[PDB]
Amino acid sequence: GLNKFIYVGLVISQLLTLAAYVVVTAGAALLQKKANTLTLFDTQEGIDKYTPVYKEVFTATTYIIAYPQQPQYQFQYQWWIIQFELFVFLLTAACTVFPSIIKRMRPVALTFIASALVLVMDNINAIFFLLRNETAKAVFDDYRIATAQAGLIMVGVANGLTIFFLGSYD
Amino acid sequence: GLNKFIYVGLVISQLLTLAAYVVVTAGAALLQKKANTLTLFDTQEGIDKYTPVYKEVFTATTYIIAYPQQPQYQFQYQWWIIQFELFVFLLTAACTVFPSIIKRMRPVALTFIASALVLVMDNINAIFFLLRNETAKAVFDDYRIATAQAGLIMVGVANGLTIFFLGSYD
Amino acid sequence: GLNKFIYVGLVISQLLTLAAYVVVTAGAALLQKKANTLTLFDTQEGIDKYTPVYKEVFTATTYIIAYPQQPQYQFQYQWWIIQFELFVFLLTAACTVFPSIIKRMRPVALTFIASALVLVMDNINAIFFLLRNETAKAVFDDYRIATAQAGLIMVGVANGLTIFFLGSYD
Ligand SMILES: [Hg+2]
Ligand SMILES: [Hg+2]
Ligand SMILES: [Hg+2]
Numbered sequence: 001g002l003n004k005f006i007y008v009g010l011v012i013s014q015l016l017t018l019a020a021y022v023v024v025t026a027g028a029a030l031l032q033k034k035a036n037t038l039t040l041f042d043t044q045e046g047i048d049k050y051t052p053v054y055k056e057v058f059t060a061t062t063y064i065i066a067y068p069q070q071p072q073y074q075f076q077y078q079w080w081i082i083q084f085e086l087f088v089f090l091l092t093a094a095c096t097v098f099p100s101i102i103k104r105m106r107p108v109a110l111t112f113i114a115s116a117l118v119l120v121m122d123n124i125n126a127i128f129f130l131l132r133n134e135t136a137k138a139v140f141d142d143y144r145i146a147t148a149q150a151g152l153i154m155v156g157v158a159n160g161l162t163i164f165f166l167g168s169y170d
Numbered sequence: 171g172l173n174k175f176i177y178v179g180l181v182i183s184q185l186l187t188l189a190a191y192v193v194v195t196a197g198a199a200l201l202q203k204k205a206n207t208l209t210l211f212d213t214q215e216g217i218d219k220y221t222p223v224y225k226e227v228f229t230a231t232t233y234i235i236a237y238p239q240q241p242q243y244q245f246q247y248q249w250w251i252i253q254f255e256l257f258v259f260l261l262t263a264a265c266t267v268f269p270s271i272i273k274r275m276r277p278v279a280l281t282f283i284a285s286a287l288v289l290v291m292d293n294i295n296a297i298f299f300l301l302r303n304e305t306a307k308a309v310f311d312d313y314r315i316a317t318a319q320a321g322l323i324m325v326g327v328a329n330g331l332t333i334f335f336l337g338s339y340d
Numbered sequence: 341g342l343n344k345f346i347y348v349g350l351v352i353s354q355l356l357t358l359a360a361y362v363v364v365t366a367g368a369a370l371l372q373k374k375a376n377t378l379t380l381f382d383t384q385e386g387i388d389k390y391t392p393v394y395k396e397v398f399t400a401t402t403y404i405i406a407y408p409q410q411p412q413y414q415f416q417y418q419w420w421i422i423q424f425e426l427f428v429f430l431l432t433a434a435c436t437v438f439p440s441i442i443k444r445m446r447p448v449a450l451t452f453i454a455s456a457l458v459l460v461m462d463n464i465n466a467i468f469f470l471l472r473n474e475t476a477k478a479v480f481d482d483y484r485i486a487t488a489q490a491g492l493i494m495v496g497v498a499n500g501l502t503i504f505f506l507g508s509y510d
Binding site: 059060061062106107110111113114115117118121122125126128129132163164167168 | 232278
């Protein structure tokens with residue numbers, strides 16, 4: 001009846017997820033590259049000058065930790081929620097392709113996607129501050145900050161639909 | 171036998187969730203009314219002296235991001251869980267009003283309420299420091315902070331009960 | 341069939357959860373020992389001097405709030421996730437020792453362990469900065485922080501294994 005209507009919505013949200021996943025990978029790789037190449041800390045004048053300013057803008061956002069001379073560590077926690085969200089998608093998508101296993105494995109996937117949703121919400125609230133900060137948009141390109149943003153907003157929304165449809169099936 | 175007990179514990183927990191929404195929104199609006207009236211940044215004089223404390227006080231908590239001259243974004247993440255709790259309350263309540271759909275719908279609510287709960291727990295640790303910080307209590311008065319805090323404690327336990335009752339049911 | 345394999349994974353994960361629980365509490369007791377006794381603030385020289393950088397290092401992490409002169413509250417949010425992990429242990433061990441109670445009580449334990457898993461993650465990404473930050477390792481010795489970070493990894497994994505087997509059981 002509508003249980004056939006539901007499997008469709010679950011099929012959509014997995015495309016929505018996988019679509020979202022690529023957009024976050026885009027924005028994250030953009031910022032990581034931009035962080036990997038930074039003119040600021042090269043000369044020691046721009047170290048004593050820009051190390052406090054770098055630390056205080058990334059700390060001001062209360063999620064991302066500041067790693068001024070460690071660009072690989074800067075986004076380490078943002079790279080994590082992407083890895084985690086893919087691990088969930090590996091499950092939630094395999095729930096869709098072989099729906100027979102939803103009986104057994106659905107409580108597992110929800111327990112993980114419940115946790116994943118919190119890290120995205122924490123990120124969005126934190127990265128929204130990055131877009132409202134001019135110095136942030138200056139050093140890290142404002143479109144790279146925005147690409148990662150909408151990527152996560154898609155993830156959270158795709159998780160919401162993944163929660164509804166996979167939550168109620170059969 | 172055990173079920174009619176759990177349904178009452180579920181209906182009771184659903185009502186205590188409702189009373190928790192008031193006290194939260196009360197102190198949340200009380201703090202917001204305080205954030206909109208701040209005369210610190212009225213005088214350009216006070217703009218320079220009070221801003222370093224205003225940022226430090228809020229950023230000393232690892233949750234609430236400091237928006238000194240943007241009072242609308244100050245509590246933005248507090249209002250989020252309020253709306254998110256409201257959305258999750260819509261899910262959990264319709265479960266208890268039409269218990270037949272607890273079968274199909276239940277894991278949707280448990281997934282969100284999980285994500286919703288940690289957002290509640292992360293908030294209380296923050297507000298606690300604000301209750302333990304004198305500068306914050308002078309600007310935003312204590313009863314406003316404590317009211318928002320008292321409410322946050324109430325939706326926390328109410329969500330905890332809903333997980334125990336709605337969680338284990340027929 | 342494969343069901344008894346899942347149960348073997350559950351028993352080992354439940355014992356890995358208990359085994360992990362000790363290592364974190366040790367690393368937490370080490371830090372609280374070092375926090376409850378430190379002479380930085382013994383004299384008014386160290387109070388005015390080291391308090392700004394004390395509040396700088398903890399707030400440099402995006403998680404742990406800085407309480408320089410009140411060591412009782414210093415690690416407060418870290419002791420919290422330790423009790424929440426134990427409360428879930430009562431739930432998931434009751435499920436694992438008495439599998440009868442699983443069907444009704446598993447969503448209760450799953451919803452709670454879903455929220456517990458994100459607090460362990462948020463802690464890890466934070467205390468990692470402590471390990472990567474030189475000034476923080478001189479006050480609280482590096483072995484104490486690693487002892488704490490050890491148990492936090494072991495706790496998060498055993499939660500992931502528990503969620504897998506306890507979620508997929510029967
Ligand atoms: Hg699955
Ligand atoms: Hg519902
Ligand atoms: Hg249980």
